[PDB]
């Protein structure tokens, strides 16, 4: 029942003596007979470790307490005591340090604390983010050692929220060239600055942002416990969200809470059976504590009914119990406060949140980024690739119908992939998708960046690798990341192709159609292929997913996967010159081929009638504008004009 302690300052020793003298048996009901002893920390790390190894484990101690700020290791962490007591499964109370790397159960077997580490701070930040729908955030963490674990936890929680952030990487510890990333963040979704570095590493970023006037509206600064103290309050903008946990700042209150937790743990241990003493660490003794895993379970895997904090639902890692927060605001270094976290959900206090932008309501955090990468993909019915007339200048033509043709400056290859590998000549593209892009550009103002992608494949998930992981490729892999979220292409939403992101309203329902030289699905010629029935369609398209879902065309899939070409210009030129037999694509291409060529039968035999929606990101504030534009185009007379100009175009 002997309990030890290791402090450095006399005030901590006096507080521990008072705590073990008075109000020591109040925790619980059993009359404890603990023998509390304290060891003064030595200025040298080796001498103190030797004193620990010769006193604590020799006196058969059960728990300790390390809360002195001036550690002899000059690193603000109890390194020697922990490295010496970890062998005997001793619960080293590391409440003096907040390093999330030391709180991990990987390198430290028995190492608990009563101070929220960087992981708990990141969890609280993530909980505060989902309240105001802060999905696309940026992380400006400059620290490396604990910053890596912080950003890993952040990205894992973002993936668990069915989303993905944009900036979760570090740049440099304590740098001054953050002007580029700040200017890039000036045109992003949210201005929520996530900084979880040390004092100087955060002060450098603060002064660098102050030199660039980065103190506008919408900048939600999330700081930790020891990030703004002494002089970092001036470099940081006035109005930062200063997190603070109960009994975290006051040393006496923290020591009292730790003593109460230790008393509750000892009482819970005495409640059950198997009350054994740790092996005495004398010379030649290399015994392991038998009740080590059980002690870890009763510490972190169980709950606490009483104690100093008087809360329940203790964390499963022994870092910090989820309780009420005391987050105080620092508007010009005053006593103002913001919404505190009450362990399960943030509850607003009497005075609402004050923001540095100037107002008190919800600031302009969730801002629509004007930089929208409009990736252009080569399509057969809509995109008409042709060399540009003038150098860097397109001539908008006008057909015999009532819809004008607007050519966009599509920067990309001038021809298909087999023709040229890749070009950077800004040719002219025009089509239904181009007209929709022009309508969206003239409706709402935004900086569009058009660029023609090289490949023309959709990039399904049938035989792709994607760094040996299940993700999308081609032009859809960048959509989930957040770079090119607006794709001007009629993506058929009929299967798990669109289970991650939601598309817009389907504007066409033509579906898919086969070509004849196989006149219908009921004919055995279409079901059972042959040597001449070639199915050289676009590789990794929706037809592949449709054939994977259907189980009656197993003999057809064998002559389908090994025939799909990567490009489509060679395929359409072959099927036009009487080389291919079956080509499953949209009805507009077959209609145009039948209009321009009379030798082709073009029976159609279309029976899919699937919808065609514009590919857009699910979590984005621009997916509603696309639906509104589609609805306006449908209710107006432009629908039949676009149809007669693009789909049913006769020459």
């Amino acid at each position: 029942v002997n309990i030890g302690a290791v402090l450095s300052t006399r005030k901590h020793e006096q507080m521990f003596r008072e705590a073990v003298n008075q109000a020591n048996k109040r925790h619980g009901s059993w009359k404890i007979q603990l023998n509390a002893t304290s060891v003064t920390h030595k200025p040298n790390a080796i001498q103190m470790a030797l004193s620990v190894c010769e006193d604590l484990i020799s006196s058969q101690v059960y728990a300790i307490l390390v809360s002195h700020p001036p550690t002899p290791n000059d690193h603000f962490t109890p390194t020697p005591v922990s490295y010496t007591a970890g062998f005997y499964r001793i619960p080293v109370l590391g409440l003096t340090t907040r390093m999330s790397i030391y709180s991990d159960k990987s390198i430290h077997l028995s190492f608990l604390r009563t101070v929220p580490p960087y992981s708990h701070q990141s969890s609280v930040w993530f909980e505060m983010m989902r309240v105001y729908n802060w999905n696309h955030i940026i992380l400006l963490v400059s620290d490396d050692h604990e910053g890596r674990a912080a950003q890993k936890r952040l990205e894992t929680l973002l993936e668990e929220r069915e989303s993905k952030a944009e900036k979760v990487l570090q740049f440099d510890p304590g740098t001054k060239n953050v002007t580029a990333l700040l200017m890039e963040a000036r045109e992003l979704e949210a201005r929520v600055i996530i900084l979880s570095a040390s004092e100087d590493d955060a002060a450098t970023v603060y002064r660098a942002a102050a030199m660039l006037n980065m103190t506008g509206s919408g900048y939600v600064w999330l700081v930790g416990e020891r990030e703004i103290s002494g002089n970092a309050l001036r470099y940081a903008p006035d109005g930062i969200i200063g997190l603070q946990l109960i009994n975290g700042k006051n040393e006496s209150a923290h020591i009292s809470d730790a003593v109460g937790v230790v008393a509750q743990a000892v009482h819970e241990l005495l409640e059950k059976e198997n009350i054994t003493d740790p092996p005495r660490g004398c010379v030649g003794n290399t015994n392991i504590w038998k009740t080590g895993p059980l002690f870890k379970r009763v510490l972190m895997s169980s709950k606490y009914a009483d104690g100093v904090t008087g809360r329940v639902e203790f964390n499963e890692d022994g870092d910090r119990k989820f309780a009420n927060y005391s987050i105080m605001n620092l508007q010009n270094r005053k006593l103002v406060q913001v919404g505190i976290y009450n362990g399960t959900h943030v509850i607003p206090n009497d005075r609402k949140i004050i923001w540095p932008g100037g107002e008190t309501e919800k600031p302009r955090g969730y801002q629509m980024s004007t930089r929208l990468k409009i990736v252009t993909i080569h399509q057969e019915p809509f995109v008409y690739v042709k060399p540009t007339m003038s150098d860097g200048t397109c001539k908008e033509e006008f057909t015999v119908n009532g819809d004008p043709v607007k050519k966009v400056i599509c920067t990309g290859p001038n021809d298909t992939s087999p023709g040229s590998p890749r070009h950077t000549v800004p040719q002219c593209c025009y089509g239904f998708c181009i007209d929709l892009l022009i309508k969206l550009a003239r409706t709402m103002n935004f900086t569009y960046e058009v660029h023609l992608v090289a490949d023309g494949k959709f990039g399904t998930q049938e035989r792709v690798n994607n760094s040996n992981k299940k993700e999308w490729n081609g032009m859809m892999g960048e959509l989930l990341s957040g770079q090119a979220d607006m794709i001007v292409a009629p993506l058929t939403i009929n299967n798990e192709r669109a289970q991650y992101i939601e598309f817009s309203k389907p504007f066409k329902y033509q579906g898919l159609t086969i070509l004849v030289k196989i006149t219908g699905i009921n004919d055995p010629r279409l079901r059972n292929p042959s040597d001449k029935f070639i199915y050289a369609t676009v590789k990794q398209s929706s037809v592949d997913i449709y054939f994977r879902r259907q189980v009656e065309l197993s003999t057809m899939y064998r002559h389908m996967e090994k025939h799909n070409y990567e490009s489509a210009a060679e395929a359409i030129q072959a099927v036009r010159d009487n080389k291919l037999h079956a080509f499953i694509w949209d009805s507009a291409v077959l209609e145009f081929e039948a209009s321009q060529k009379c030798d082709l039968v073009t029976t159609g035999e279309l029976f899919f009638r699937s919808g065609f929606g514009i590919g857009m990101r699910k979590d984005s504030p621009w997916k509603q504008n696309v639906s509104l534009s589609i609805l306006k185009s449908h209710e107006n007379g432009f629908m039949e004009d676009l149809d007669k100009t693009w789909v049913r175009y006769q020459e």
């Binding site: 219908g520 073009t602 159609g604 029976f607």
Partner: peptide, 25 residues
């Protein structure tokens, strides 16, 4: 299953959807 039982013979059951473009000429 009881509803989709007397639809065995279908001259233009699954061919009626081809109305957007030209048929076999």
């Amino acid at each position: 299953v009881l509803h989709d039982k007397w639809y065995k013979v279908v001259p233009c059951g699954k061919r009626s959807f081809a109305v957007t473009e030209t048929l076999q000429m």
